């Protein structure tokens, strides 16, 4: 029974190459395959090309790379993929995204004075972060959301870099300005970057306000301890006097605490201030109530010369009962009955930043333990029984120095993998989760689960790779009869960045001449770093600090053929505003948010594994996945 | 060490203040020629 299946990204994209994995099970000889794509509904033939032949020398796996043109509301538009395997035709409708790529705006400074010039560059790249030549529309709005200047340049042959500039008139409103840009082929998708306009003057020293703890324990007698560090822009320590105050925040409203105002000296460029719990409680009129709210510190340092003055501020200090938080957002919500289930505990501090080195465990198994890595994820693994009853797991932090009362707990519920016709045939993919780095190799484990009556029928696994919303690679993993565990040497390149998924499935005939498909997906995180590398150090491999007006060599170590844009800014500027900058970490954070996968791994059934990994399965036997018609992932239902 | 200086702007526009200083016995020095905006007497307003 020749089974012709097809797999394409859950959501296709315009003006981009999307892969399409063709297949043919139990097929003899060759087979002429013709892939075609039409608009929906009706027929307009957006792409008729791309035809290949499945050779038995390749285990009958095809590979067709296609591209959907433009030829241009509120309702999504769909396309109809049509793969004809010789005579038998198999078609499936897929959602299409109007997103052509991303746009990154960069401004030299973070704040500008009325009369100066703003230098901003627009980076134009695709979904693969590779430069591209398109038409970009750039506007500039004032604080009251009113466009004043609009351009229409093209990154054609400009290597994806659009240098621009605009002079700010003396007569203009101060506040928060915004620069909005978007591709001409997608007005709905707009990117923006803000720059403040204010009449200011660069100070001569910065002020840092760091509380001992990145939070506050309500039952802490000592109180909120805060350290005031002040140093000149050139590094030298600062001598002066600081004025520090506190307050409580509630959503958007702030309540100052006049009785917390302190005036501490600043010697050796350091200061020490404490907010006693007594004054805090007296600030209101039920300590357990303040739980959830936040505290903010407002310092103000003045030199002993009374020449300069700087105002700093730390806001967002959480008031919680436990110094930690647990999230099962990186743990699959489906387990395999009678198979080792992996738990990816995600411990984080009250603020949101991952917590390093914090032991965790399960409700039972007092002996089981695991520490948290640098990413904020712990490695846990439990053995389940062949029961089709939901598995309830409660993970408990086991960090010493504290008590069972100061610990944070969380409970989740995993559901068994529903096998087609209750045949109890499962597939588990266990991954040695460590901080993956481009260049290493990953040991992908394939654990089979089925009676021997049909185990000899399984001879290969079909795995696919998901990356940035596209099919990176797809191959076959051989399997000999009697093997429940086979390893797949998957080499990690610079493409897997940031995160890549791995779906694996097998198909056979059993039970009662009924076609069955079993799958399992897994989401792994790779080290977050530059796809290549870019370093900027001092050319002078010797000497000390330069002198105003002096020259200095500036070494730049980057990739060959790459263009590098530079910019130097006085640190004094960041003392007034350090927000809305451009960081490589902020880039990956955006890429990850645009992921089509909405599950750490596994699923309720075979049709769920693919869908929960950002894939669509469709065969000639009938086994298909759940219809997806919603752009965003599931509305996070706690 | 701070050093006071009383001045009175006479003409509007981007004017220029310049101070220099040298140490005795030591052969070191440094002058600063910064510029400050000199605006007349009035108040902002946005009449419709
Ligand atoms: C999905 O589809 C992808 C695109 O078709 C496939 O990617 C290719 O797969 C191979 C194997 O992984 C890639 O790796 C190597 O390619 C290099 C050699 O450089 C290539 O030249 C090739 C051959 O052209 C000609 O071949 C004939 C026959 O030998 C010669 O007569 C002639 O002289 C010349 O060699 C190109 O076809 C080729 O791809 C490169 O340009 C080779 O040294 C390795 O042995 C291996 O073949 C290959 O680069 C991929 N193609 C790319 C990246 O463009 C992929 O196999 C398929 N599978 C999935 C799901 O990924
Ligand atoms: C012409 O003059 C008028 C006043 O005659 C200006 O309108 C507004 O004037 C008031 C009072 O000075 C300003 O209130 C300030 O608001 C800021 C920030 O809060 C604001 O919130 C509103 C509504 O959400 C936004 O529209 C603003 O952008 C801003 O976010 C607050 O921090 C201060 O405490 C102060 O109360 C107001 O900002 C100002 N309107 C502005 C700047 O948009 C008007 O600006 C000026 N020119 C024109 C034609 O707009």
Swiss-Prot record, chain A:
The modification Phosphoserine is found at residues 16, 48, 270, 276. Disulfide bonds join 598-633. Changing residue 75 to G: In allele C3F; risk factor for ARMD9; results in decreased binding affinity for regulator factor H; results in reduced sensitivity to cleavage by factor I. Glycans are attached at residue 63. The record marks 512-513 as: (Microbial infection) Cleavage. This is Complement C3 beta chain. It comes from Homo sapiens. The gene is C3. The chain holds residues 23 to 667 of 1663 of the full protein.
